[PDB]
């Protein structure tokens, strides 16, 4: 349980 | 939604339904991105900035 | 370089957050 970071879309998780 | 870069974030909803992802669009003419602030809690009573 | 830090995706994935899990009322790690 942890509210994680941004989905980080575009270090961006998504790109 | 959570990707303003791809999804229009013009709010289609109100009346407190579903928590809202809240970001900060960056105001600088290079990489205007949306820094993820938080998932809006259903209730906010105190906010503070410094 | 391979890793889970970044993922070149055809489409970004708005909502990637929480992704948490738990077992209430259960002896659990
Ligand atoms: C956010 O709220 C939306 C509610 O607005 C309604 O749906 C959109 C698509 C427009 O057609 C608008 O005119 C409607 O009144 C939901 O539709 C949407 O699914 C919600 N998004 C999430 C991620 O829950
Ligand atoms: C944005 O950042 C880049 C990074 O090098 C810089 O070249 C550019 O001048 C910056 N522009 C603004 C408006 O901050």
> In this structure, which ligand is nearest to the CA of B15?
1
> In this structure, which ligand is nearest to the CA of B27?
2
Strand pairing of B21-25 and B34-39?
antiparallel
Distance CA B21, CA B37 (A): 8
Report the Cα C18 to chain-centroid distance in Å: 7
Which of B4, B6, B8 is most worth mutating to test chain C (most C CB atoms within 10 A of its CB)? B6
In Å, what resolution does this model reach? Answer: 4.2
Find all residues with CB under 8 Å of B9, minimum gap 6, and list them.
B1
Residues 9-28 of C with CB under 8 A from A: 9, 11-22
In the numeric block, which tokens belong to residue B20?
A: 């809202």
Distance CA C29, CA C23 (A): 9
In 3D, which of B41, B37, B46, B48 has the Cα closest to residue B16? B41
CB of C10 within 8 Å of a chain B CB? The answer is no
Find all residues with CB under 8 Å of C23, minimum gap 6, and list them.
none
């Amino acid at each position: 349980v942890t509210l994680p970071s941004f989905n980080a879309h575009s270090d961006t998780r998504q790109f | 939604s959570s990707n303003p870069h791809l999804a229009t974030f013009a709010i289609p909803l109100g009346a407190t339904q579903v928590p809202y992802y809240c970001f900060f669009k960056v105001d600088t003419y290079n990489s205007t991105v949306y820094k993820f602030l938080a998932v809006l809690p259903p209730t906010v009573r105190e906010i503070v900035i410094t | 370089t391979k890793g889970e830090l970044i993922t070149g995706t055809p489409k970004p994935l708005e909502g990637v957050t929480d992704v948490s899990f738990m077992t209430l009322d259960v002896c659990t790690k």
